[PDB]
Short mmCIF file of C-alpha atoms and ligand atoms in Angstrom, two decimals:
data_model
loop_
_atom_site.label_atom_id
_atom_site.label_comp_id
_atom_site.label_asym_id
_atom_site.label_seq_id
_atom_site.Cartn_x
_atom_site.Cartn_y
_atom_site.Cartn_z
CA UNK V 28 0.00 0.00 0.00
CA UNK V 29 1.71 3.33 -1.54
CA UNK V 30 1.83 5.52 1.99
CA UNK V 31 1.39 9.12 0.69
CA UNK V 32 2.62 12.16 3.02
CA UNK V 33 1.39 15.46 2.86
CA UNK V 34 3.08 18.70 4.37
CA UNK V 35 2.67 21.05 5.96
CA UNK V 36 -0.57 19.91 7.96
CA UNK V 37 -1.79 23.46 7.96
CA UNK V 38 -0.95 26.37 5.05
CA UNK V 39 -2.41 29.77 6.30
CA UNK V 40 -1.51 31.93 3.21
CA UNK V 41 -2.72 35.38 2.90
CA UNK V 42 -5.61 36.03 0.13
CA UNK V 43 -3.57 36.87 -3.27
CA UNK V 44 -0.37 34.98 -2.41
CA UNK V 45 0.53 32.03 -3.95
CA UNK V 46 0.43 28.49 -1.61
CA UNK V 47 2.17 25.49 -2.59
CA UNK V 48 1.28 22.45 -1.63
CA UNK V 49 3.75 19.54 -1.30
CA UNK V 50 2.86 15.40 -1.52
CA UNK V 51 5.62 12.19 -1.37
CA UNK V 52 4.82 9.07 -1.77
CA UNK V 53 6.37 5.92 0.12
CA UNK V 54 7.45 4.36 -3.95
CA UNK V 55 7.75 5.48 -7.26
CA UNK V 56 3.90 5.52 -8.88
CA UNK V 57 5.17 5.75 -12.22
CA UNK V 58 3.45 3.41 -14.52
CA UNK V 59 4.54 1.62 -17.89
CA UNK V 60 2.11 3.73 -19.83
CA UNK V 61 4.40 6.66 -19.94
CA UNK V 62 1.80 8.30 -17.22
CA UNK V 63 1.78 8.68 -12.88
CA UNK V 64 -1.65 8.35 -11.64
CA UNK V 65 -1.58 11.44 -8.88
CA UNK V 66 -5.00 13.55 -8.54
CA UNK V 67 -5.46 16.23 -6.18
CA UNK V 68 -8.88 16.34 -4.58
CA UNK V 69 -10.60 19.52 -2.32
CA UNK V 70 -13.15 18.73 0.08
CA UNK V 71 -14.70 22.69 1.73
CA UNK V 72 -16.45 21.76 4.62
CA UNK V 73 -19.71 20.09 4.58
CA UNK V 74 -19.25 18.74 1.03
CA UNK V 75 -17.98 15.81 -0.87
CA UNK V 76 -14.75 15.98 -2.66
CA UNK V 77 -14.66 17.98 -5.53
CA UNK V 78 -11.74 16.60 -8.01
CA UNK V 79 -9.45 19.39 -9.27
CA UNK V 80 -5.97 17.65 -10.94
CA UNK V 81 -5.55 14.53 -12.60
CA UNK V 82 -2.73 12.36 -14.18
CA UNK V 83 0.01 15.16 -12.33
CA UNK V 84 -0.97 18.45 -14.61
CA UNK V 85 -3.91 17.87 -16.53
CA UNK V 86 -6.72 20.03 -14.78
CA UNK V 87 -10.30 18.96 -14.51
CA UNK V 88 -13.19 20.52 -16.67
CA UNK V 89 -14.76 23.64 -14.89
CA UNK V 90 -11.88 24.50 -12.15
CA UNK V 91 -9.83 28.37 -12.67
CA UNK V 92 -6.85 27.80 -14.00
CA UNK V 93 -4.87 29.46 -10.77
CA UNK V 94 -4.69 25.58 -9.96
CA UNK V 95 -1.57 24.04 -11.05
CA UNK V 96 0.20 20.85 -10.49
CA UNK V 97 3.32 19.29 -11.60
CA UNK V 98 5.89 16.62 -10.34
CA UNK V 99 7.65 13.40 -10.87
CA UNK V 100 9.18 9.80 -9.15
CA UNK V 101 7.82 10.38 -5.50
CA UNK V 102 7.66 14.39 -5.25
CA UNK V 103 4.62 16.24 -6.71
CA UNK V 104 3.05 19.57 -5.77
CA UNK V 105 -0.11 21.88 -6.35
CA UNK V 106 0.38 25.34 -6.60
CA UNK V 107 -2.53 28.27 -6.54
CA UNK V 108 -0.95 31.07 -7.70
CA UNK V 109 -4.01 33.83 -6.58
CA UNK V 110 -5.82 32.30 -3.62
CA UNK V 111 -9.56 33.45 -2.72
CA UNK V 112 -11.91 32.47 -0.05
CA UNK V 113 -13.69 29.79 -2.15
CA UNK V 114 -10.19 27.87 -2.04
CA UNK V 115 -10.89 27.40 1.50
CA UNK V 116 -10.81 23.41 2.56
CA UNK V 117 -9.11 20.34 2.82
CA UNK V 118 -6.63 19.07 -0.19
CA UNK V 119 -5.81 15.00 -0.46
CA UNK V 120 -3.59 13.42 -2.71
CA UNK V 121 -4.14 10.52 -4.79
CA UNK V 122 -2.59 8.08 -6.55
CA UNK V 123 -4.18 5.25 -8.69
CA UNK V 124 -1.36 3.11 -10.17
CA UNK V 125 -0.61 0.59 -7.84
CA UNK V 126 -3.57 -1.31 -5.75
CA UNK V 127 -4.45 -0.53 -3.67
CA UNK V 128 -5.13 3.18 -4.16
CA UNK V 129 -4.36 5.14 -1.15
CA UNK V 130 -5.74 9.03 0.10
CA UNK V 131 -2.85 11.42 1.27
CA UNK V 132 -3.07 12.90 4.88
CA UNK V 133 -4.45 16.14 3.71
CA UNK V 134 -3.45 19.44 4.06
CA UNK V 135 -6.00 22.14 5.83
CA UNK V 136 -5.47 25.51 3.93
CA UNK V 137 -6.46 28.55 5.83
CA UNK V 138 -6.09 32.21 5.30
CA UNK V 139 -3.51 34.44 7.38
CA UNK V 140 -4.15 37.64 8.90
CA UNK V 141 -3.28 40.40 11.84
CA UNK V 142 -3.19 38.83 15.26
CA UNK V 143 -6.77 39.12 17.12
CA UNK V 144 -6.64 38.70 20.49
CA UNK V 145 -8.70 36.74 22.78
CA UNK V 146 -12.00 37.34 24.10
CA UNK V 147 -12.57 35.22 26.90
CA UNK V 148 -15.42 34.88 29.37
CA UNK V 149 -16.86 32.46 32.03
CA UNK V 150 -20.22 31.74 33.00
CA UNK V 151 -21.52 29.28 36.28
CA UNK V 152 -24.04 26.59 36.06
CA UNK V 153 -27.84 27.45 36.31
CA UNK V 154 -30.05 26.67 39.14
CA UNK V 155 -32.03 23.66 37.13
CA UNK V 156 -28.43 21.69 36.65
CA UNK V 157 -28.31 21.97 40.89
CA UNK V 158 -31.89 20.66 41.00
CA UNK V 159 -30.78 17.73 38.44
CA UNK V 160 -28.15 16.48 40.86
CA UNK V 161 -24.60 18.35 38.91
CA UNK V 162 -22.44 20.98 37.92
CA UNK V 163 -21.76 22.56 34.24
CA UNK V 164 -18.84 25.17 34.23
CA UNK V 165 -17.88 26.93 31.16
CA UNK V 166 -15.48 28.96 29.98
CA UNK V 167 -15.65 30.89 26.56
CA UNK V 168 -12.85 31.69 24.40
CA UNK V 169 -14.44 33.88 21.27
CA UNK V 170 -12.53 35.06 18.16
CA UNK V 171 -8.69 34.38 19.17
CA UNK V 172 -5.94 33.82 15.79
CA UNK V 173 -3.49 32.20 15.75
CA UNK V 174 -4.26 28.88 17.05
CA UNK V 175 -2.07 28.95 19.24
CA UNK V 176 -3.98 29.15 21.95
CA UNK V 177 -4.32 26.67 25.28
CA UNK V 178 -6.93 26.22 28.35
CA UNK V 179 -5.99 25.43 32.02
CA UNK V 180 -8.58 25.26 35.08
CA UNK V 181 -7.04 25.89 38.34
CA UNK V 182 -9.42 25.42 41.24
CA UNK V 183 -8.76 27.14 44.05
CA UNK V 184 -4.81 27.15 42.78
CA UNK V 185 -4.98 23.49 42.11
CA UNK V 186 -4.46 22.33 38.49
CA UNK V 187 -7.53 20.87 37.40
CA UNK V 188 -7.76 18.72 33.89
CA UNK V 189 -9.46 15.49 34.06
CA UNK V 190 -12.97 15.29 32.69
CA UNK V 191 -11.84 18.54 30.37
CA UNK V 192 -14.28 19.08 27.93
CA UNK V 193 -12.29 20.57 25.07
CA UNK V 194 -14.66 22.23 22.14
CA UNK V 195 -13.14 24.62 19.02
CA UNK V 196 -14.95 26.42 16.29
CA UNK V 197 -12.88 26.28 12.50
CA UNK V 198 -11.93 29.37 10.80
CA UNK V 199 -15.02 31.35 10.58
CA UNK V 200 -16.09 33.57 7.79
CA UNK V 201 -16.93 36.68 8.67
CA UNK V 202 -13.84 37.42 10.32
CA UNK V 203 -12.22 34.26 9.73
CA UNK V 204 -11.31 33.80 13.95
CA UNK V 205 -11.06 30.52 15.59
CA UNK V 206 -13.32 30.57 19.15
CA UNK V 207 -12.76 27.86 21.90
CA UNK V 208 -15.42 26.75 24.24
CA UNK V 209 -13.98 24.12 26.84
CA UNK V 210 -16.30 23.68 29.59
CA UNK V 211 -16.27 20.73 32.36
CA UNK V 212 -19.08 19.23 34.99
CA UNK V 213 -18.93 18.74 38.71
CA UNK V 214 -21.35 16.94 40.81
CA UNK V 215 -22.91 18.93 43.77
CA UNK V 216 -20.93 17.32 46.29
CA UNK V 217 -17.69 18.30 44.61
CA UNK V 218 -19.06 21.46 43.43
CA UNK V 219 -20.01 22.89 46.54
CA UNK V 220 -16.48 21.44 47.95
CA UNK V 221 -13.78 23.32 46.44
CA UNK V 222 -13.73 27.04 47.25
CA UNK V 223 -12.17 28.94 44.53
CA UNK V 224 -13.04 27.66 40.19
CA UNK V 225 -10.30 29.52 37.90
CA UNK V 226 -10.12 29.48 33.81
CA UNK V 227 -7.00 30.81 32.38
CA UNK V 228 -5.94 30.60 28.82
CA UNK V 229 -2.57 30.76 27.44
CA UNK V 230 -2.53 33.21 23.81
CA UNK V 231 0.36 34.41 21.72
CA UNK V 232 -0.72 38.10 21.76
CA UNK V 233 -0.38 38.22 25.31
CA UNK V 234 2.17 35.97 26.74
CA UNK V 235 1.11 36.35 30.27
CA UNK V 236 -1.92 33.78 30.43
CA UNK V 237 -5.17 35.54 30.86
CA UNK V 238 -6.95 34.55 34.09
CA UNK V 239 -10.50 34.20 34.32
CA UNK V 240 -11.85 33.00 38.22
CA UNK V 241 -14.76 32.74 40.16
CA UNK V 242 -14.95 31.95 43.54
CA UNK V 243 -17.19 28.84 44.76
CA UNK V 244 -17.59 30.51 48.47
CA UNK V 245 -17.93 33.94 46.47
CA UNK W 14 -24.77 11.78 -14.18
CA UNK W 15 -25.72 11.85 -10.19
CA UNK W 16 -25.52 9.52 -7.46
CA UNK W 17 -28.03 8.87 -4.93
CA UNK W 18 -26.92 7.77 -1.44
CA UNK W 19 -29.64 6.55 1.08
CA UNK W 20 -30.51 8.44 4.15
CA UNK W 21 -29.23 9.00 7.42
CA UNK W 22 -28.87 5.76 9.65
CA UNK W 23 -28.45 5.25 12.95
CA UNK W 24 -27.53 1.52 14.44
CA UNK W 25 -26.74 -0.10 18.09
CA UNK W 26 -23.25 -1.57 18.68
CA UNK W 27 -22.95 -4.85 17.14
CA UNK W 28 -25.38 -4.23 14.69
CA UNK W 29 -24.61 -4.19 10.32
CA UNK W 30 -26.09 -1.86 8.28
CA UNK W 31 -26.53 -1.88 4.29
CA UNK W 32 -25.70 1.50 2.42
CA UNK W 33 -26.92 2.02 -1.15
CA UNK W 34 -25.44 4.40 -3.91
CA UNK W 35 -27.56 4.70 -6.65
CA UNK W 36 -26.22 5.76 -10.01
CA UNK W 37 -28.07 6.96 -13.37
CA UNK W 38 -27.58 9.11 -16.56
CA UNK W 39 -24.34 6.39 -17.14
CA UNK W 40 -23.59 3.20 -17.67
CA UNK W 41 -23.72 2.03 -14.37
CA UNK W 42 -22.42 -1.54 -15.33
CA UNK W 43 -18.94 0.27 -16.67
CA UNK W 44 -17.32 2.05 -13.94
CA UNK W 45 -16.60 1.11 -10.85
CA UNK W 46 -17.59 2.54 -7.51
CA UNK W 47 -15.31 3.42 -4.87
CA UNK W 48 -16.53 3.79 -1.49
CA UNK W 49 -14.56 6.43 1.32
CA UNK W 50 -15.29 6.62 4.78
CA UNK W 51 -14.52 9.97 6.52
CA UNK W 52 -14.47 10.35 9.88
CA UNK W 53 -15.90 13.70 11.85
CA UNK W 54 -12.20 14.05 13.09
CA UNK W 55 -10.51 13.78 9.91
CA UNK W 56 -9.16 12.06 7.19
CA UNK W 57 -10.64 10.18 3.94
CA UNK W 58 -10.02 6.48 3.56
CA UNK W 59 -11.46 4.11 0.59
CA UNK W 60 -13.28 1.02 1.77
CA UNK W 61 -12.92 -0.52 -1.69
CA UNK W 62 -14.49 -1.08 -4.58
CA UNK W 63 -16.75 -2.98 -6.72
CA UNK W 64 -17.67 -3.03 -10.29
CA UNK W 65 -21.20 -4.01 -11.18
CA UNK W 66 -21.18 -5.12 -14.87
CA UNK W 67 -18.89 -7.64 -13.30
CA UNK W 68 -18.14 -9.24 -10.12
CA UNK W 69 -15.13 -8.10 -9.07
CA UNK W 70 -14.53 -6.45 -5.58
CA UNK W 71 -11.49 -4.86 -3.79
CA UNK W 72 -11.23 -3.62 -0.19
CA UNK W 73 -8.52 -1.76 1.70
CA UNK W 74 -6.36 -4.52 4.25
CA UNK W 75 -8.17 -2.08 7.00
CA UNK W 76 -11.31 -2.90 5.45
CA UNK W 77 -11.16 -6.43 4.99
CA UNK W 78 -13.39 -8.26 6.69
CA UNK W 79 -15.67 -5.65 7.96
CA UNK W 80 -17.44 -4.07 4.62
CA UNK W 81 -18.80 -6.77 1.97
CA UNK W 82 -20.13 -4.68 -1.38
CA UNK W 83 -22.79 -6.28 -3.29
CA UNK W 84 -24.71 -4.62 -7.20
CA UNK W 85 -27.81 -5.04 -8.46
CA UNK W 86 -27.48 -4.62 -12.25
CA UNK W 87 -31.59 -4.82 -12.40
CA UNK W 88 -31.89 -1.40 -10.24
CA UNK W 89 -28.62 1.15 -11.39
CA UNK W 90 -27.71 0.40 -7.07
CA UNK W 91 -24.66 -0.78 -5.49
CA UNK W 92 -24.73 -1.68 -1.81
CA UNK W 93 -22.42 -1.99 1.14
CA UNK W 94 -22.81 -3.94 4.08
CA UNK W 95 -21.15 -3.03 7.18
CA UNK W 96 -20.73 -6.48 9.79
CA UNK W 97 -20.00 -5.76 13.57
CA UNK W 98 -20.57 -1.78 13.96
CA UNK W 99 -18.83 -0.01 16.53
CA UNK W 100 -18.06 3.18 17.60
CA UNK W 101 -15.10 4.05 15.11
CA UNK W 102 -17.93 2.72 12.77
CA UNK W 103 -19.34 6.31 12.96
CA UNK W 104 -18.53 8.69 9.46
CA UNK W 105 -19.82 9.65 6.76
CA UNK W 106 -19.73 7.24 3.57
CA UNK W 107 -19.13 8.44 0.18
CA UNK W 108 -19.65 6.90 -2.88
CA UNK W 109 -18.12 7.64 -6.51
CA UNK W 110 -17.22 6.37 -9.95
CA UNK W 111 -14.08 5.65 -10.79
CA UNK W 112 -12.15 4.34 -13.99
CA UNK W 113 -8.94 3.23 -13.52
CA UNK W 114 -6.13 4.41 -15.33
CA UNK W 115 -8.87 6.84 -16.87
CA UNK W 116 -11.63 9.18 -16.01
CA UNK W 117 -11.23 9.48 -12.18
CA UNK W 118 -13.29 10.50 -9.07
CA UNK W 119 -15.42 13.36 -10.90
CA UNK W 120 -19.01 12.71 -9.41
CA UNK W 121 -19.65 11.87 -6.10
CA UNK W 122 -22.82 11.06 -3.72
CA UNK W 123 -24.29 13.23 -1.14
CA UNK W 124 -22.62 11.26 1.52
CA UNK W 125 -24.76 8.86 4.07
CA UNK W 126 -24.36 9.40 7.61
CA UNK W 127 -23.82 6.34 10.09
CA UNK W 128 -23.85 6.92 13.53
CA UNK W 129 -23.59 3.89 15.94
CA UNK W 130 -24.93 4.21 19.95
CA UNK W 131 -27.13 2.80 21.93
CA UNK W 132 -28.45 5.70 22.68
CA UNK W 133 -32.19 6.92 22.11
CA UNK W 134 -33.93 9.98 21.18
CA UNK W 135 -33.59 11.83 23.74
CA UNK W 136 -35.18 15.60 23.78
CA UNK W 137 -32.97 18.33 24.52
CA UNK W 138 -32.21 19.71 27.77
CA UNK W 139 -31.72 23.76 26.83
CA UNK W 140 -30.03 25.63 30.04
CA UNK W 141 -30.31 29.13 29.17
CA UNK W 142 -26.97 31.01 30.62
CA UNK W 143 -26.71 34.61 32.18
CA UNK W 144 -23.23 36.46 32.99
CA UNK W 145 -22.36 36.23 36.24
CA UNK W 146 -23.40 37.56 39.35
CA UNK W 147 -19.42 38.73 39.80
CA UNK W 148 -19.08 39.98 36.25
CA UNK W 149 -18.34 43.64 34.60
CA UNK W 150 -20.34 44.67 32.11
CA UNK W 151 -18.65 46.49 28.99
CA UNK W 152 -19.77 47.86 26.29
CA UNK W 153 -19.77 44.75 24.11
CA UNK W 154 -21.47 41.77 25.80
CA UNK W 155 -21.74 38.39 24.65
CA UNK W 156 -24.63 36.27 25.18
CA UNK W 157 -24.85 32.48 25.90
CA UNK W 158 -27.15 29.85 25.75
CA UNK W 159 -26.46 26.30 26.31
CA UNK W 160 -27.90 22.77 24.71
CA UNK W 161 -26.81 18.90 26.67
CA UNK W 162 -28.64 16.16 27.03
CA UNK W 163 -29.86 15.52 22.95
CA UNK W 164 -29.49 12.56 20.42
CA UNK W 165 -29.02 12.70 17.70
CA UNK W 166 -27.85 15.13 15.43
CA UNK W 167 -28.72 17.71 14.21
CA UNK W 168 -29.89 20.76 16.01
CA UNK W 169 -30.43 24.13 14.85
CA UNK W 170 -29.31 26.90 17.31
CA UNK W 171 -30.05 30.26 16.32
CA UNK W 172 -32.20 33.31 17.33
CA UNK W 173 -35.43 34.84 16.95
CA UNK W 174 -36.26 34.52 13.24
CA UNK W 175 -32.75 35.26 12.58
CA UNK W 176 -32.77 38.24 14.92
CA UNK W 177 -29.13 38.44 15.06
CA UNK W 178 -27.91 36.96 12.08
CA UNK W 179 -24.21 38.24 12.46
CA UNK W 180 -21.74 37.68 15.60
CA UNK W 181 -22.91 34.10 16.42
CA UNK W 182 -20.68 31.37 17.03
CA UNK W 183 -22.29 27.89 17.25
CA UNK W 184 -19.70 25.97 18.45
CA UNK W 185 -19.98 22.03 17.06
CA UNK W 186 -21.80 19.58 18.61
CA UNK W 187 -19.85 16.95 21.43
CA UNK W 188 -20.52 14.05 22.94
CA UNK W 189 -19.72 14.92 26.87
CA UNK W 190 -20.98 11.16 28.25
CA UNK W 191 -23.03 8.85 25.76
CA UNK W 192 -25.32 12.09 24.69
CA UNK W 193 -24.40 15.57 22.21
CA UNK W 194 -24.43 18.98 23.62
CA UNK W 195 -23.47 22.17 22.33
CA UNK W 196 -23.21 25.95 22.71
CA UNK W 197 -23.15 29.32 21.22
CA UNK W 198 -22.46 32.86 21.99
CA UNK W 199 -23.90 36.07 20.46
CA UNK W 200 -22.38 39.13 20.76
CA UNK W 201 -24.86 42.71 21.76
CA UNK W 202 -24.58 45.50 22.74
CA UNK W 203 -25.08 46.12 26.67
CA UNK W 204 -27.45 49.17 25.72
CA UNK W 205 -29.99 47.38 23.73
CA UNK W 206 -30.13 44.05 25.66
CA UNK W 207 -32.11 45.56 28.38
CA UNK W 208 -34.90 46.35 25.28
CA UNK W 209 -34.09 44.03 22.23
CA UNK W 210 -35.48 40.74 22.74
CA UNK W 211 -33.82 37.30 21.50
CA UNK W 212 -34.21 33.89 21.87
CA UNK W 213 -31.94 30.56 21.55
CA UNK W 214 -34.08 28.59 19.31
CA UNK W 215 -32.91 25.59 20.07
CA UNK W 216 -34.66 22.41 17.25
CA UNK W 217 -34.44 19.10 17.37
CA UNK W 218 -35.78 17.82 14.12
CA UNK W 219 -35.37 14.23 14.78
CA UNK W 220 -38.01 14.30 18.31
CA UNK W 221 -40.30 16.85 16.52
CA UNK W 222 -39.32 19.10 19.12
CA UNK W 223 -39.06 23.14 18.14
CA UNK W 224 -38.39 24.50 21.79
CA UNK W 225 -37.59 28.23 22.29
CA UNK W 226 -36.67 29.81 25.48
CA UNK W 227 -34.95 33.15 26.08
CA UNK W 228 -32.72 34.23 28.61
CA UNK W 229 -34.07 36.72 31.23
CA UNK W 230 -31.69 39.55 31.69
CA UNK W 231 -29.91 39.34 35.18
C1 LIG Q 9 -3.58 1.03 -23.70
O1 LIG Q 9 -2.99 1.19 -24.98
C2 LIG Q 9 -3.43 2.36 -25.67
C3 LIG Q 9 -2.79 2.32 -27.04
O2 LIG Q 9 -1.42 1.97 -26.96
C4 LIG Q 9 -3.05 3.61 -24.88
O3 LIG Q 9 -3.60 4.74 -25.54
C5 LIG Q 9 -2.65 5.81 -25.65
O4 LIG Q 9 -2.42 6.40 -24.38
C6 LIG Q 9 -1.48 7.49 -24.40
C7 LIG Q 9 -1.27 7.91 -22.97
O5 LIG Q 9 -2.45 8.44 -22.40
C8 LIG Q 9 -2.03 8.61 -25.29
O6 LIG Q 9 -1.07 9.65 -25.37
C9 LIG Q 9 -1.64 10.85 -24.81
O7 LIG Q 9 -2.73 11.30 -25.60
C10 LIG Q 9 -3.36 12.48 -25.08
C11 LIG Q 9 -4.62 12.75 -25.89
O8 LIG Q 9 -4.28 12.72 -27.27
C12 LIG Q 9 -2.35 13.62 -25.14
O9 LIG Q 9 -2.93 14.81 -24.63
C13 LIG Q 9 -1.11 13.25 -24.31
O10 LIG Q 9 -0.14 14.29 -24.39
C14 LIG Q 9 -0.53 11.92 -24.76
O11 LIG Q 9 0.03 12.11 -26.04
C15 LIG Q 9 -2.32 8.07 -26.68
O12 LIG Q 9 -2.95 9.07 -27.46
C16 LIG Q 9 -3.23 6.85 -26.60
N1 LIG Q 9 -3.42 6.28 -27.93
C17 LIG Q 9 -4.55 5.68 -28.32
C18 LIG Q 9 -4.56 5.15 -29.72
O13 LIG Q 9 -5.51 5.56 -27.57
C19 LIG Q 9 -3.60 3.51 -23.46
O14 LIG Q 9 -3.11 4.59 -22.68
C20 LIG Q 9 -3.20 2.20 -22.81
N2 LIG Q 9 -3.82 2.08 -21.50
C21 LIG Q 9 -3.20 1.55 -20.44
C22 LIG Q 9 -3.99 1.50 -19.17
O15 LIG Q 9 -2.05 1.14 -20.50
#
């Protein structure tokens, strides 16, 4: 089974700057023909793949010509020269010369821009989850870019990550910002136990982490 | 040329399942039809294949074993059965024609959906959230309104007849326990929330349920 690499997981490229993609492949796919079976596929999110190169270079009826691929032996690559946001998605390799034929890891292209900073927040549980016999914390982390961005609950100074519910939003549209919303749940007993809940969050713009607490005893 | 994929399905543990991808305006007999699975994480992977003019049948070494594929040349339909479902059972199945060495991947099926769980169809449990008792109020505040406690998918968050069409951020859907829940956050201003009125409307198309309930202001 030809193994077929991808890089770089993740392409953020600007909108008019050229992105090249890069695929390997564990063999040589040549075939006898005098042809290389490689196709390059697109998937956008909610939707089937869409097929956009085939046999290395020769480009699919109805796709702009801004796609371009090209290659050889083990080493092909897919260039978009002028990138816009209906190039947004999810781009797999293929290759269908030797059986079986085998998907590449995919590469998720997104779109660069300034540094937003976080907007965090924290709400408590509700009165009907303390009738129901529990606790629901949650913390919100809205429109924060770069993904680098990580979550850390200290109760009452003590480190707290099992039972972590971890929950992120992709690249949105509008202002194409990722958002975070881990949360976790306590039972009464333990929620009415500890004395101080904390949420901080660990960003790029601001190396300090941001601390968001509440106070059980309040 | 179009192919039809059956409808959503939803199976217990150690149950099978039969897909069907229907195929006209072609000749269905002549091309064969390779089946992907795609998990919600990530990733495509092909099942196999199987062309129905003849008999012949190929399945990934992951596969083997656990997806038989089975035509009917009467009806233009090509089935796959699914033995032994489990939890990493749960994708989304596509199905498309191929010709190898030739025409490739260029029309695919809507994708079928195949979640396995013993779960049932449970209502949802909407806990409307308010900030904080121990909260400042800025001039940009962002609303929340939470959803736990539903199966299965999907369910339309959103607000009063699309009262605030912009600034929402419906975060995707996760199982916390052996049920889905979700969230979302809208962001108003702290004049006009006071006066302007809107509602979480929270659906669950699968119960019949269309539940909407607002959050009081604190
Ligand atoms: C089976 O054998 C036939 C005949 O030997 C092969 O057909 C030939 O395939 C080559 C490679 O695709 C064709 O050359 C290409 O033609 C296209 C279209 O004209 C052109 O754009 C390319 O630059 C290249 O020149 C060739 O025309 C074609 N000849 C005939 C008579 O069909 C076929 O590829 C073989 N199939 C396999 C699976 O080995």
């Amino acid at each position: 089974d030809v193994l077929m690499t991808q890089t770089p997981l993740s392409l953020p490229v600007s909108l008019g700057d050229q992105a090249s993609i890069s695929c390997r492949s564990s063999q040589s796919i040549v075939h006898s023909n005098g042809n290389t079976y490689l196709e390059w596929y697109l998937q956008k999110p909610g939707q089937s793949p869409k097929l956009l190169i085939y046999k290395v270079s020769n480009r699919f009826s109805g796709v702009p010509d801004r796609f371009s691929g090209s290659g050889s032996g083990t080493d092909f690559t897919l260039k978009i020269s002028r990138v816009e946001a209906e190039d947004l998605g999810v781009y797999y390799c293929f290759q269908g010369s030797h059986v079986p034929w085998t998907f590449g890891g995919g590469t998720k292209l997104e779109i660069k821009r300034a540094d937003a900073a976080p907007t965090v927040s924290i709400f408590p549980p509700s009165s009907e989850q303390l009738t129901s016999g529990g606790a629901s914390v949650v913390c919100f982390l809205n429109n924060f870019y770069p993904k680098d961005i990580n979550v850390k609950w200290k109760i009452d100074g003590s480190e707290r990550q099992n039972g972590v519910l971890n929950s992120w939003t992709d690249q949105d549209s509008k202002d194409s910002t990722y958002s975070m919303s881990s949360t976790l749940t306590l039972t009464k007993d333990e929620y009415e136990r500890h004395n101080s809940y904390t949420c901080e969050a660990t960003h790029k713009t601001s190396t300090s982490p941001i601390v968001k607490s509440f106070n059980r005893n309040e | 040329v179009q192919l039809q994929q059956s409808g959503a399905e939803v199976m217990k543990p150690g149950a099978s399942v039969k897909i069907s991808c229907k195929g006209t305006g072609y000749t269905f007999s002549s091309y064969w039809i390779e089946w992907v699975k795609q998990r919600p994480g990530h990733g495509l992977e092909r099942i196999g294949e199987i062309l129905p003019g003849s008999g012949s049948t190929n399945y990934n070494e992951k596969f083997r074993g656990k997806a038989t594929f089975t035509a009917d040349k009467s009806s233009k339909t090509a089935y796959m059965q699914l033995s032994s479902l489990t939890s990493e059972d749960s994708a989304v199945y596509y199905c498309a024609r191929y010709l190898p060495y030739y025409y490739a991947m260029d029309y695919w099926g809507q994708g079928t959906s195949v979640t396995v769980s013993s779960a049932k169809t449970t209502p949802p449990s909407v806990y409307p959230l308010a900030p904080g008792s121990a909260a400042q109020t800025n001039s940009m505040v962002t609303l929340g309104c939470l959803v736990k406690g539903y199966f299965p998918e999907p369910v339309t968050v959103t607000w009063n007849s699309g009262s605030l069409s912009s600034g929402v951020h419906t975060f995707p859907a996760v199982l916390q326990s052996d049920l889905y829940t979700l969230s979302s956050s809208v962001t108003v201003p702290s004049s006009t929330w006071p006066s302007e009125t809107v509602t979480c409307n929270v659906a669950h198309p699968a119960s019949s349920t269309k539940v909407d309930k607002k959050i009081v202001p604190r």
